[PDB]
Design a protein around this ligand. Sequence first.
Ligand SMILES: *C(=O)/C=C\NCC(=O)CCO
Ligand SMILES: [Zn+2]
Ligand SMILES: [Zn+2]
Ligand SMILES: [Zn+2]
Length: 265
Amino acid sequence: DLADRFAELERRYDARLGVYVPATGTTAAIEYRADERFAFCSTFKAPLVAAVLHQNPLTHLDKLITYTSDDIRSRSPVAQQHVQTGMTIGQLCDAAIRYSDGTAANLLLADLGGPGGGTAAFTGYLRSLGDTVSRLDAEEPELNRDPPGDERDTTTPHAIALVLQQLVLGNALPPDKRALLTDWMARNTTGAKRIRAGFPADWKVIDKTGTGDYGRANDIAVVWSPTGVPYVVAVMSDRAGGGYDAEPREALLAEAATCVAGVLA
Ligand SMILES: *C(=O)/C=C\NCC(=O)CCO
Ligand SMILES: [Zn+2]
Ligand SMILES: [Zn+2]
Ligand SMILES: [Zn+2]
């Protein structure tokens, strides 16, 4: 069955794989280690942007945030281009989603909850969406590096899927703010080889990736069939047996997505 097929992916990639797709009117839920904890890595940046959108008027997107070169302690290809002069909230949202910029996400955390309270406030946003499981405890780059088995900085496939479902398909956000989030996800530069690679080209896909130590590679997505029927897909993985420097395997996620697409076709 589907569980056997997912188990074979795990054997071949020497990995742990988590998959969740919510039920619809006509399709059963797809669940594989869906309630096991996996590190968010950069997947948290999608609800983070949602939180910042939700709590502020649209004009807040043009609020200028200044920061220094020494605020960059993580891979930040956009934020480095604009040090000292700063970046608007909107620019930070774009960078955090489309490039997975680390400093951009930290600055958004500070905008949401202040310098000390950002990770709690982010977690609290998830709580407001009924997610009582996920937790963000550290910011970039530490959130990508927690040991296997540690609950800190983790979500579950099930939990993050339900969050993304409310954000993109539900009414957690007003239409205008929702459209900004979905648009940034649609124009991301990091996700072509993950869930997108498992769905035929006539399906629409928007996603947010994450990558971390211990071979961590995640992708969360909303997809629409050629006739507009939506599904939410969360795929999470690690290769912790290889140690902190284990290589991530994007193709594992593409394969998991292909399995899902096959069932939903
Ligand atoms: C989001 O996932 C942002 C950064 N992740 C850290 C990274 O890619 C390094 C993995 O070794
Ligand atoms: Zn079997
Ligand atoms: Zn569950
Ligand atoms: Zn603000």
